[PDB]
């Protein structure tokens, strides 16, 4: 049974460095190159580099030439990727993936079936923020909503009218800004006849900071 | 199939009904062995390893000096002496300098002066010894079992040959087994060869040359802080005008060494083991237990399709990859070359004996290799109306 | 570096094709072309390699082809379980690997539906709190693939924009949100517009 | 007195009443000039300076490589190309490697491969050009004015001679002045000599040899990041088995250069100026304005005492230091050698003309130099009963 | 007028480094070597090293080989001595002293009259202490006294009976301990007949810490 | 490294000699022998060099000589202004400089007087405050040069000892103090003794 198991998620500040591990089981580790491929949330896969586990040779993408070190420990059957001088653009899921080296021990040309097994991926969040509660602003068939800005870390939970109002409600996934802090919004579609008559309160609570906030939304 | 695409490829045909086949395996080469009623087998020497090497001696080819000091004496007061002269890390030399009243001596004349400096190596090269019994040859075998290029152990086997175990038998699943009786002791003679390492590059060099290198050296078993013999090889002293003496290092000798290594075999290191990408091994292959796995299959009846354009290898053979629409696998692939599409009389021959489809699942692929006649012919895959063809021209 | 369409959809039982166009130094130069399937929350899975080869276990409904600088993954007999992102990849003449943008495959479980777009200006309270965000809500589109363009008085704007990946509503259509971040002064300088593109159509809102 | 104790000491005697005296000043030498009715003067060339040198060219003798990269192409797809081939810091080379289905090519055969690596210099040597007009010779003069060894500008003068100012006059206070008419343009010919600097050591080398050095080089006025011509001189490419290609640096050439410099003059650096401790200068000394300062003094009458034991210099002269108990200074020192202590008939001669005590304070010291006859004689200092003597044997 | 002027006194902690300057005037700086000689309080002179101002060459005592750097700036006519990895034994007055180099620019043999001019000396105190008041203990013709222990920095002033008693009084100079803190004592000789009858109070005040202390001394 | 007597004294008008003994590699090997005068609070002043030479301005009452490994500074016609510390020095065969221990020169303004020694144990309060210092006071000696030895039950002790340089009392004799630092336990382990040596005599006190 071939398996690649990667380390758990990490949060780091811009300028610092992350090291992620990928432990291989079920196959002879030294007969393979280990590649690192990352994926920013909602985005495409991006190849970073590889190490030949049998002889230690490496190859890095020129985009990551200076900041990336890929190493290996044969006794532990473990590959390591270290990225230094982190920036906001480095927030991504980091995967390892294997490919076989040839029978002379060299990794000049890959096999045709490269990346046949992938690790499960490791989330890395680059941010300078510290545990902090959100700012709640209003937004106004009609659509009204709740803007939940500048919080850290995830998650935020939002309800409407303390749970009385569930129909036509949608809470969006969070957006990570240049700020280094998340944002989201929650929307509800209600009849326009009820706007001036009926009240709509947005309940956002963010337990990491232990902040419970209620906010009326009105024209 | 591992020889397909190697330029230095040899073809060896054994006798029909023969037991033995002699071959010469070389690093960078690959041998395709064929025989009637046997599967075609590719065999290749992929690595040669030397283990358990012993460090012989290290040479300093680049040195530096520091902590220079001097002792001086007035005329008639005898020879100068510095306690660094009792320290093996220091190099020292004596001369004479003019002395007199103006520089503190009661008598005029030549006063003794000695100058010492601490020697340190910047870069060294290391020689290790080789025992012929500690050689290991790794041989890869790949049967022409109709598997296609890029399939993610029945067609493939690894065999290890040593001086103490020159015989091996590689088991090839449904194909039976192959016997190897090799001559490891014959060939490259490690009797007079040391293993030299410099700046993480490695060579095999002759002992005679290694022992005559005019450079400071330390003992193989000298560890940690080295003790350098013949430091004078890289250090010289100069004096000027009977006033002073200085000590200088001869520059790096790295280029002279690199020049002397132009006619030498190169090597690499696998941990503590030396790995050579040069040399050969003469073997006799026993074919008595080799069998055709699919010789009892029925013919494939469904339609084939070329998944790649047939391609000519550097030796004029042709590789063909096909996908098979049917479900009656495992089955024999109808495959031939013809000059007359009505006769379908066979011309040329196949290199891949007994081409077959293995899987019972639809749309599986297989690969075979052909040896076309000179001139024009048709590659014909399959039977009847749905057969596919590819017109070939050789030379 | 490799170009594939943003979204592809088909009815269950039908065939679809996803193209992947590169250059003579990756896709048109070598047969190191592969396709990977990625379901949400999981690692990519090799579906095809060497242009046309399938790993053991991958259904033969998946097949591949290549012509010039364009590779193609064809999926016949679409099933709901084929819904995922698909990525082509190639080894390059430089010894590197490049991936395509990724194609969302939708297996149509309802008729296609155009999005509803609502554009919220900065809340009067937000400007008093010294920040200004413009919010564009897109709802009830299907399939869930859109592109959003922000304009400041009839001219494109790319800085300050962030957009979410479409998420399923409870009614099983899709929704998405796009934010444009501004200082209170920038906002007062100009109109602002959000235009959504879905299945070749464009819906526009201005404030 | 500065020649006393120098082993390479020449004695020059001018004619009585003569105007000129020819001398040859050499680094490491010292000339003592004597003439009747003149003070004895020591003259020595202490430094030779070259200013305003211009950087000609730098050679890399030790290099390294990094950031190695490759581009490869399938057969019939043409030549490989890397954009580093357009970067002058990179060295690149092409070869062919076996390609086929197994490594991603539709056709079998030789595919193009190119490999590049970034070149960097570890150590370089720099050549600077010399203009003959920019030479400066520094000459020290020291009168035998009876001052003792270790006195903490009347007896001492510094003169500077240049091609554009070959004449000087050194003023010697009470002794008058000395004229020098020298030949700076004659002598060491800097017409064909460059100034080479390597590892903070310096030589004068021939231009012809410097321009034919087979090493990468950058232009004299190339500053900051260098641009290296002929990088190929230190970089080579190797390939193996139609499978790969690597790039290697030839080792340091420092030792070869040091070997070629064995027959070359050495130099030092004084900021931006070159300082040579080798060479000479031919001068004609004008003596017409040289005078004896103490020729009008009265005789000392008080008692002398030896403060050091008289000492023989390497040329057989003898130095005498005495302390004087009297207060009638300035006065002439009674000083002679005699074989017959009753006659006190003078034998030998003095090198220090007109030995004198200068100070009027008690217990002041003075030094003089004598030229004894061969055999036995008495050094006699002072007059009358309190005179002191020292029996001398020469050879 | 030849003059060598050195920098003012410095206090530093063990393990740190001191740099002392010596500016030369009245003579051509580049024609001389500058030597450094130190003197622990109450102790002998100890040669440390020299620099040739004309060519920058140096020579260090082997006792100070690793810790001493002597440099020069010709434009400023200034020599510098830097001592690193300080220990308690380094507390001393540091002097510079000149000697002339020969006319070839070299300093192989010194002149006979080396060190003819000396700088005025710079006090360097190596201690880890910080501003702190003293501890006052008693001590008992007869002699009695006041022990003033463990203070930093100097000075301490001591009187007896608020100034009424001055005859037969002697206050000793301070002693710097392995502690890193000074100590002293003050003694008075009084008649033995007055011991039990007459009172003797010791007034120690230490303004750096602004501590005024009075302490009775009795059998 | 060079050895000179600790103290030297003479009456005004008389002559004295200060010796300085080295080895064949400094004083017996070269003429680089010098003498320096150091007044309290000032830098050393060159008095003699090259064994016998005087700098201009130095009185001829100072003279030097050398014999084997011993150099000598003679001062005739002693004046009160000659009172100072004097140091010999030599350049060495190794290119270093060595100084002698230094000689205190006293010009006698009163008859020589032996010291009075008083030894205070740790104050009963000090041990309760967890530290123990033993204090040795020396007073009314002349000339002001002493050496002090601390003993713990008839055996020498050098660690924990600190001693002051003799300082003038108001009556113009000299005084000095020596401390022995101990933990309260060390003190209780043993006798302790302070012995002062002045002009070849020794005065001892014990507690
Ligand atoms: Ca050792
Ligand atoms: Ca440049």
PDB file of C-alpha atoms in Angstrom, chain B residues 68-228:
ATOM      1  CA  UNK B  68      53.979  34.090  11.588  1.00  0.00           C
ATOM      2  CA  UNK B  69      56.671  34.735  14.217  1.00  0.00           C
ATOM      3  CA  UNK B  70      60.413  35.298  14.505  1.00  0.00           C
ATOM      4  CA  UNK B  71      63.305  34.969  16.962  1.00  0.00           C
ATOM      5  CA  UNK B  72      66.634  36.788  16.408  1.00  0.00           C
ATOM      6  CA  UNK B  73      70.067  36.802  18.061  1.00  0.00           C
ATOM      7  CA  UNK B  74      73.093  39.080  18.114  1.00  0.00           C
ATOM      8  CA  UNK B  75      76.369  37.993  16.481  1.00  0.00           C
ATOM      9  CA  UNK B  76      78.354  35.534  18.670  1.00  0.00           C
ATOM     10  CA  UNK B  77      75.160  34.868  20.683  1.00  0.00           C
ATOM     11  CA  UNK B  78      74.419  31.693  18.707  1.00  0.00           C
ATOM     12  CA  UNK B  79      71.452  30.383  16.778  1.00  0.00           C
ATOM     13  CA  UNK B  80      67.971  31.813  17.128  1.00  0.00           C
ATOM     14  CA  UNK B  81      65.237  29.484  18.353  1.00  0.00           C
ATOM     15  CA  UNK B  82      61.434  29.660  18.538  1.00  0.00           C
ATOM     16  CA  UNK B  83      59.332  27.210  20.532  1.00  0.00           C
ATOM     17  CA  UNK B  84      57.074  26.876  17.461  1.00  0.00           C
ATOM     18  CA  UNK B  85      59.960  24.823  16.060  1.00  0.00           C
ATOM     19  CA  UNK B  86      58.713  22.045  18.370  1.00  0.00           C
ATOM     20  CA  UNK B  87      55.166  22.265  16.954  1.00  0.00           C
ATOM     21  CA  UNK B  88      54.469  20.002  13.981  1.00  0.00           C
ATOM     22  CA  UNK B  89      51.873  22.428  12.615  1.00  0.00           C
ATOM     23  CA  UNK B  90      54.574  25.044  12.000  1.00  0.00           C
ATOM     24  CA  UNK B  91      57.169  25.407   9.273  1.00  0.00           C
ATOM     25  CA  UNK B  92      60.402  27.185  10.186  1.00  0.00           C
ATOM     26  CA  UNK B  93      63.616  28.382   8.618  1.00  0.00           C
ATOM     27  CA  UNK B  94      66.840  30.137   9.633  1.00  0.00           C
ATOM     28  CA  UNK B  95      68.918  32.816   7.935  1.00  0.00           C
ATOM     29  CA  UNK B  96      71.313  35.641   8.899  1.00  0.00           C
ATOM     30  CA  UNK B  97      70.657  39.392   9.099  1.00  0.00           C
ATOM     31  CA  UNK B  98      72.940  42.380   9.619  1.00  0.00           C
ATOM     32  CA  UNK B  99      73.106  43.498  13.258  1.00  0.00           C
ATOM     33  CA  UNK B 100      74.942  46.239  15.076  1.00  0.00           C
ATOM     34  CA  UNK B 101      74.690  49.104  17.529  1.00  0.00           C
ATOM     35  CA  UNK B 102      71.809  50.694  15.605  1.00  0.00           C
ATOM     36  CA  UNK B 103      69.532  47.710  16.271  1.00  0.00           C
ATOM     37  CA  UNK B 104      70.593  46.789  19.780  1.00  0.00           C
ATOM     38  CA  UNK B 105      73.621  44.494  19.448  1.00  0.00           C
ATOM     39  CA  UNK B 106      76.973  45.090  21.110  1.00  0.00           C
ATOM     40  CA  UNK B 107      78.844  43.508  18.201  1.00  0.00           C
ATOM     41  CA  UNK B 108      78.543  44.098  14.471  1.00  0.00           C
ATOM     42  CA  UNK B 109      77.938  41.305  12.032  1.00  0.00           C
ATOM     43  CA  UNK B 110      75.610  38.511  10.994  1.00  0.00           C
ATOM     44  CA  UNK B 111      73.013  37.592  13.599  1.00  0.00           C
ATOM     45  CA  UNK B 112      70.879  34.462  13.489  1.00  0.00           C
ATOM     46  CA  UNK B 113      67.195  34.787  12.616  1.00  0.00           C
ATOM     47  CA  UNK B 114      64.486  32.124  12.512  1.00  0.00           C
ATOM     48  CA  UNK B 115      60.944  32.542  11.159  1.00  0.00           C
ATOM     49  CA  UNK B 116      58.002  30.178  11.684  1.00  0.00           C
ATOM     50  CA  UNK B 117      54.458  30.054  10.369  1.00  0.00           C
ATOM     51  CA  UNK B 118      51.461  27.828  11.098  1.00  0.00           C
ATOM     52  CA  UNK B 119      50.515  25.612   8.136  1.00  0.00           C
ATOM     53  CA  UNK B 120      46.872  24.807   7.348  1.00  0.00           C
ATOM     54  CA  UNK B 121      45.297  22.928   4.439  1.00  0.00           C
ATOM     55  CA  UNK B 122      42.605  24.646   2.414  1.00  0.00           C
ATOM     56  CA  UNK B 123      41.836  21.749   0.059  1.00  0.00           C
ATOM     57  CA  UNK B 124      42.934  18.105   0.018  1.00  0.00           C
ATOM     58  CA  UNK B 125      42.350  14.996  -2.090  1.00  0.00           C
ATOM     59  CA  UNK B 126      41.862  11.501  -0.632  1.00  0.00           C
ATOM     60  CA  UNK B 127      42.959   8.089  -1.914  1.00  0.00           C
ATOM     61  CA  UNK B 128      41.168   4.859  -0.914  1.00  0.00           C
ATOM     62  CA  UNK B 129      42.176   1.253  -1.595  1.00  0.00           C
ATOM     63  CA  UNK B 130      40.143  -1.407  -3.396  1.00  0.00           C
ATOM     64  CA  UNK B 131      39.843  -5.127  -2.733  1.00  0.00           C
ATOM     65  CA  UNK B 132      38.824  -7.096  -5.851  1.00  0.00           C
ATOM     66  CA  UNK B 133      36.541  -9.394  -3.823  1.00  0.00           C
ATOM     67  CA  UNK B 134      34.307  -6.393  -2.962  1.00  0.00           C
ATOM     68  CA  UNK B 135      32.915  -5.851  -6.477  1.00  0.00           C
ATOM     69  CA  UNK B 136      29.200  -6.130  -7.228  1.00  0.00           C
ATOM     70  CA  UNK B 137      27.677  -6.065 -10.719  1.00  0.00           C
ATOM     71  CA  UNK B 138      23.965  -5.293 -11.112  1.00  0.00           C
ATOM     72  CA  UNK B 139      22.279  -6.727 -14.226  1.00  0.00           C
ATOM     73  CA  UNK B 140      18.775  -5.787 -15.369  1.00  0.00           C
ATOM     74  CA  UNK B 141      16.668  -8.100 -17.513  1.00  0.00           C
ATOM     75  CA  UNK B 142      13.568  -7.080 -19.417  1.00  0.00           C
ATOM     76  CA  UNK B 143      11.549  -9.609 -21.352  1.00  0.00           C
ATOM     77  CA  UNK B 144       9.854  -8.647 -24.644  1.00  0.00           C
ATOM     78  CA  UNK B 145       6.557  -9.663 -23.071  1.00  0.00           C
ATOM     79  CA  UNK B 146       4.349  -7.333 -25.202  1.00  0.00           C
ATOM     80  CA  UNK B 147       4.126  -4.766 -22.398  1.00  0.00           C
ATOM     81  CA  UNK B 148       4.019  -1.226 -23.749  1.00  0.00           C
ATOM     82  CA  UNK B 149       6.401   1.672 -23.126  1.00  0.00           C
ATOM     83  CA  UNK B 150       5.460   3.340 -19.861  1.00  0.00           C
ATOM     84  CA  UNK B 151       3.690   0.609 -17.930  1.00  0.00           C
ATOM     85  CA  UNK B 152       3.459   1.702 -14.311  1.00  0.00           C
ATOM     86  CA  UNK B 153       7.863  -8.161 -11.784  1.00  0.00           C
ATOM     87  CA  UNK B 154       7.279 -10.749 -14.413  1.00  0.00           C
ATOM     88  CA  UNK B 155       8.848  -8.995 -17.412  1.00  0.00           C
ATOM     89  CA  UNK B 156      11.630  -7.439 -15.284  1.00  0.00           C
ATOM     90  CA  UNK B 157      14.291  -8.902 -13.023  1.00  0.00           C
ATOM     91  CA  UNK B 158      17.399  -7.717 -11.180  1.00  0.00           C
ATOM     92  CA  UNK B 159      20.434  -9.984 -10.769  1.00  0.00           C
ATOM     93  CA  UNK B 160      23.549  -9.375  -8.683  1.00  0.00           C
ATOM     94  CA  UNK B 161      26.902 -10.951  -9.601  1.00  0.00           C
ATOM     95  CA  UNK B 162      29.942 -11.000  -7.296  1.00  0.00           C
ATOM     96  CA  UNK B 163      33.379 -12.674  -7.392  1.00  0.00           C
ATOM     97  CA  UNK B 164      32.197 -15.103  -4.697  1.00  0.00           C
ATOM     98  CA  UNK B 165      28.815 -15.709  -6.407  1.00  0.00           C
ATOM     99  CA  UNK B 166      29.429 -15.601 -10.173  1.00  0.00           C
ATOM    100  CA  UNK B 167      26.258 -17.591 -10.967  1.00  0.00           C
ATOM    101  CA  UNK B 168      22.675 -16.369 -10.719  1.00  0.00           C
ATOM    102  CA  UNK B 169      19.223 -17.510 -11.774  1.00  0.00           C
ATOM    103  CA  UNK B 170      16.623 -14.836 -12.495  1.00  0.00           C
ATOM    104  CA  UNK B 171      13.005 -15.983 -12.282  1.00  0.00           C
ATOM    105  CA  UNK B 172      10.699 -14.445 -14.935  1.00  0.00           C
ATOM    106  CA  UNK B 173       7.271 -15.653 -13.756  1.00  0.00           C
ATOM    107  CA  UNK B 174       5.356 -17.162 -16.651  1.00  0.00           C
ATOM    108  CA  UNK B 175       8.514 -17.064 -18.778  1.00  0.00           C
ATOM    109  CA  UNK B 176      10.357 -19.475 -16.464  1.00  0.00           C
ATOM    110  CA  UNK B 177      13.894 -18.522 -15.505  1.00  0.00           C
ATOM    111  CA  UNK B 178      17.209 -17.471 -17.015  1.00  0.00           C
ATOM    112  CA  UNK B 179      20.609 -18.683 -15.817  1.00  0.00           C
ATOM    113  CA  UNK B 180      23.762 -16.560 -15.795  1.00  0.00           C
ATOM    114  CA  UNK B 181      27.318 -17.884 -15.364  1.00  0.00           C
ATOM    115  CA  UNK B 182      29.564 -14.814 -15.523  1.00  0.00           C
ATOM    116  CA  UNK B 183      33.305 -14.045 -15.246  1.00  0.00           C
ATOM    117  CA  UNK B 184      33.510 -11.165 -12.700  1.00  0.00           C
ATOM    118  CA  UNK B 185      37.189 -11.714 -11.845  1.00  0.00           C
ATOM    119  CA  UNK B 186      38.144 -11.215 -15.496  1.00  0.00           C
ATOM    120  CA  UNK B 187      37.917  -7.687 -16.813  1.00  0.00           C
ATOM    121  CA  UNK B 188      38.891  -4.456 -15.104  1.00  0.00           C
ATOM    122  CA  UNK B 189      41.871  -5.231 -12.858  1.00  0.00           C
ATOM    123  CA  UNK B 190      41.591  -3.418  -9.503  1.00  0.00           C
ATOM    124  CA  UNK B 191      44.949  -4.887  -8.514  1.00  0.00           C
ATOM    125  CA  UNK B 192      46.844  -1.619  -9.082  1.00  0.00           C
ATOM    126  CA  UNK B 193      44.030   0.963  -8.832  1.00  0.00           C
ATOM    127  CA  UNK B 194      43.259   3.414  -6.042  1.00  0.00           C
ATOM    128  CA  UNK B 195      40.090   5.488  -5.760  1.00  0.00           C
ATOM    129  CA  UNK B 196      40.803   9.250  -5.724  1.00  0.00           C
ATOM    130  CA  UNK B 197      38.352  11.863  -4.430  1.00  0.00           C
ATOM    131  CA  UNK B 198      38.804  15.606  -4.987  1.00  0.00           C
ATOM    132  CA  UNK B 199      36.178  18.350  -4.597  1.00  0.00           C
ATOM    133  CA  UNK B 200      33.379  15.723  -4.623  1.00  0.00           C
ATOM    134  CA  UNK B 201      34.564  14.339  -7.980  1.00  0.00           C
ATOM    135  CA  UNK B 202      36.086  10.853  -8.182  1.00  0.00           C
ATOM    136  CA  UNK B 203      38.500   8.838 -10.372  1.00  0.00           C
ATOM    137  CA  UNK B 204      40.234   5.482 -10.490  1.00  0.00           C
ATOM    138  CA  UNK B 205      43.980   6.145 -10.621  1.00  0.00           C
ATOM    139  CA  UNK B 206      47.123   4.044 -10.610  1.00  0.00           C
ATOM    140  CA  UNK B 207      48.849   3.403  -7.276  1.00  0.00           C
ATOM    141  CA  UNK B 208      52.289   4.219  -8.676  1.00  0.00           C
ATOM    142  CA  UNK B 209      51.127   7.680  -9.693  1.00  0.00           C
ATOM    143  CA  UNK B 210      49.324   8.262  -6.390  1.00  0.00           C
ATOM    144  CA  UNK B 211      52.350   7.379  -4.249  1.00  0.00           C
ATOM    145  CA  UNK B 212      54.668   9.770  -6.152  1.00  0.00           C
ATOM    146  CA  UNK B 213      52.568  12.947  -5.765  1.00  0.00           C
ATOM    147  CA  UNK B 214      54.886  15.791  -4.598  1.00  0.00           C
ATOM    148  CA  UNK B 215      52.475  17.329  -2.091  1.00  0.00           C
ATOM    149  CA  UNK B 216      52.077  17.383   1.689  1.00  0.00           C
ATOM    150  CA  UNK B 217      50.172  14.353   2.908  1.00  0.00           C
ATOM    151  CA  UNK B 218      48.521  12.905   5.975  1.00  0.00           C
ATOM    152  CA  UNK B 219      47.920   9.305   6.908  1.00  0.00           C
ATOM    153  CA  UNK B 220      44.731   7.476   5.967  1.00  0.00           C
ATOM    154  CA  UNK B 221      43.827   6.841   9.624  1.00  0.00           C
ATOM    155  CA  UNK B 222      44.769  10.394  10.726  1.00  0.00           C
ATOM    156  CA  UNK B 223      41.382  11.862  11.690  1.00  0.00           C
ATOM    157  CA  UNK B 224      40.197  15.198  12.981  1.00  0.00           C
ATOM    158  CA  UNK B 225      43.040  17.689  12.970  1.00  0.00           C
ATOM    159  CA  UNK B 226      45.513  16.422  10.344  1.00  0.00           C
ATOM    160  CA  UNK B 227      49.276  16.088  10.756  1.00  0.00           C
ATOM    161  CA  UNK B 228      50.949  17.060   7.474  1.00  0.00           C
TER     162      UNK B 228
END
